[PDB]
Structures are given as structure tokens and as C-alpha cells.
Design a protein around this ligand. Structure first.
Ligand code: GST
Ligand code: DIN
Ligand code: MG
Length: 301
């Protein structure tokens, strides 16, 4: 539909506007069109995300894609929207659907860079463990090499994975997190072992509230690149930063972000990311939501 595509792109520029970021129709429209059948309000999930620090000059957009529409990476390559990297990452989405039950897909893009990643979601009542994932042939060797570490902190069930084709990186979105895993003592030992930035009292309180935790891995080394804790809420003042600059900008985005589901309050998902040298914050404001998110808010918010 022309209306859906134009409606989503309209909301996108608006969201980008709040952040003072410029959009590139050339790299956005061809993508939205290819997946126009998914933009139908109802069982669609659309997110517009911002990030602090050195990552504050970009706007990412995530869009769900039902499995019925077919492998989305196969789609973007075939239509000439993205080139095969000639790297194992080219086979991972496909190999994942081959070895595990994939219940849904999603793609991610940037308003100025275009397509950059896909997601493979697994059934909430049949998620794979680290063991099952590391078995996929094109999966980074780093996952198996980190199996013991993950196990030591209770990181077991994975609700979904993502593949970043430009950075050749994979995210493991761990779910059903035990209270222990998210307690300060556990979080600190984990970061310490992964050699990441140590969070303070504010950061740790935020981690304790997390519904999802995700490490980023690569094919070059067994060293985890970064670790992110995600929080879902309607509260627009949850950014885990003490910098008046962030506290301001994020609250702004959080209360002025465009969303279609008028009648309810914006669904927000905050993120605290820890890399070896720093810590930065992220915020996704859902434009489209489904009951999945409605349920998460009752369980964690
Ligand atoms: C349900 C849907 C639409 C998918 C979730 C989108 C999602 C998990 C994206 C956030 S990822 P992100 O915080 O930007 O992390 P990186 O790719 O930078 O590692
Ligand atoms: O910005 C988002 C939106 C949804 C997410 C999810 O369902 C799981 C883990 C992290 C997420 C981050
Ligand atoms: Mg992103």
C-alpha cells in the first residue's frame, strides 16, 4: 500500500527530526516498499531508535517481517538492496532457519545508511540454548567458546538473534533472566570477566530491571565486543545516565516520539551498553506494537 509506506516514512522523518538527524529517502523508501505488506497495523512492530554519545547522530529503524514473507536477507540481496559480503554472515540467517524453529523475522536499517541487519525470532515456549546455537555452521566460533561463561551467569535461553551484515557481528538476546543473573554481584562479575566498563549504582539498578540482556560477538575473535541490558517501560525518565545532557535529550525523545497506537502510552525500551572502553545509552520508541509488547509491559513494568 502507498498509504502505509508513506505513513511509516512520515513518522520516521518526524522521529529523526526530534534528534535533528537527516533522512535519506534513497536508502529508506526502496526498503520500506519491498516490505510494504508488513507495515499493516496489527501484527506489525516498528521501532525508531536513538543512542547517546558517539552514536547520537543516527537513527535506526527496526521492522518485523513474518516468516510467510520469506527470508528477508534473501530478499534484500535478490532485489539489489544489499550486496552479499562473501562472509559466513551471508549464510547465518538461512542456516538458523535450517537448524531451529524460527517464528518471525525482522530487519534493521539506518535513516542514512539503509539496510544493515536481520533478526531471527524463536518461539517463546521453545527457545534454543547456547548449545543448540553454537552448532549452526555459520555461527561465530566465539559463541561456543563463550558457552561456559554464559552458563556461569545463567545466560541460557535465547529469544532471538540478530546479524549485522556491515559490521559482521551477531547479538544473542538472552531471555527468561533469573533474578540472580541481574543482581549487582552477578552483573559485576560478568562485566569484569568480559573486561567491560564497570557500571555504577545507577547503572546496576537499571540492569536489575532488565527483561533482556545481549552480548555482541564477531567471527574474528572470541572476545565479546559489548554487552547490552534492555528495559521495557512507559516511564520516559529511565535513561541510566547522570549527564544532564542525556537526561534531557532522552526524556524529550521519549515523550515526543511518534506512535500509531494512540490511546495507550508509548512503549519504550531503554538500553545500557557496556563496551571495553565506555558505556552508552539507547532508546527505542515503538511506532507500532503488538500484544507481545503489551504483555512485556505487564510482566516487567
Ligand atoms: C521486535 C523487533 C521489531 C525487534 C527488536 C529490535 C532490536 C532488538 C534492536 C535493538 S538493537 P541495538 O540496541 O541497536 O543493538 P546493536 O544492533 O547495536 O548491537
Ligand atoms: O529496542 C528493543 C526492542 C525490543 C527488544 C526485545 O524484544 C528484546 C531485547 C531487546 C529489545 C530491544
Ligand atoms: Mg540499532
Amino acid at each position: 500500500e502507498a498509504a502505509d509506506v508513506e505513513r511509516v516514512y512520515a513518522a520516521m522523518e518526524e522521529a529523526a527530526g526530534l534528534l535533528g538527524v537527516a533522512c535519506a529517502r534513497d536508502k529508506i523508501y526502496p526498503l520500506l516498499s519491498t516490505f510494504q505488506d508488513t507495515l499493516v497495523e496489527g501484527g506489525s512492530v516498528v521501532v525508531f531508535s536513538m543512542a547517546s554519545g558517539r552514536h547520537s547522530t543516527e537513527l535506526d529503524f527496526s521492522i518485523s517481517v513474518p516468516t510467510s514473507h520469506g527470508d528477508p536477507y534473501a530478499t534484500v540481496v535478490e532485489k539489489g538492496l544489499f550486496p552479499a559480503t562473501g562472509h559466513p554472515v551471508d549464510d547465518l540467517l538461512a542456516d538458523t532457519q535450517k537448524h531451529l524453529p524460527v517464528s518471525m523475522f525482522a530487519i534493521d536499517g539506518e535513516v542514512t545508511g539503509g539496510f544493515k541487519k536481520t533478526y531471527a525470532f524463536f518461539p517463546t515456549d521453545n527457545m534454543p540454548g547456547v548449545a543448540e546455537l553454537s552448532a549452526i555452521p555459520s555461527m561465530p566460533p566465539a559463541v561456543a567458546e563463550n558457552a561456559e561463561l554464559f552458563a556461569r551467569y545463567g545466560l541460557d535461553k535465547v529469544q532471538m538473534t540478530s546479524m549485522d551484515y556491515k559490521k559482521r557481528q551477531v547479538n544473542l538476546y538472552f531471555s527468561e533472566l533469573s533474578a540472580q543473573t541481574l543482581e549487582a554481584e552477578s552483573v559485576l562479575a560478568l562485566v569484569r570477566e568480559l573486561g567491560l566498563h564497570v557500571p555504577n549504582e545507577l547503572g546496576l539498578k537499571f540492569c536489575k530491571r532488565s527483561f533482556s540482556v545481549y552480548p555482541t560477538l564477531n567471527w574474528e575473535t572470541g572476545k565479546i565486543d559489548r554487552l547490552c541490558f534492555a528495559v521495557i517501560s512507559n516511564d520516559p525518565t529511565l535513561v541510566p545516565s547522570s549527564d544532564e545532557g542525556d537526561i534531557e535529550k532522552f526524556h524529550n525523545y521519549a515523550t515526543k516520539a511518534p506512535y500509531a497506537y494512540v490511546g495507550e502510552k508509548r512503549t519504550l525500551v531503554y538500553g545500557l551498553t557496556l563496551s571495553p572502553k565506555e558505556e552508552y545509552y539507547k532508546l527505542g520508541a515503538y511506532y507500532h506494537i503488538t500484544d507481545v509488547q503489551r504483555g512485556l509491559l505487564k510482566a516487567f513494568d
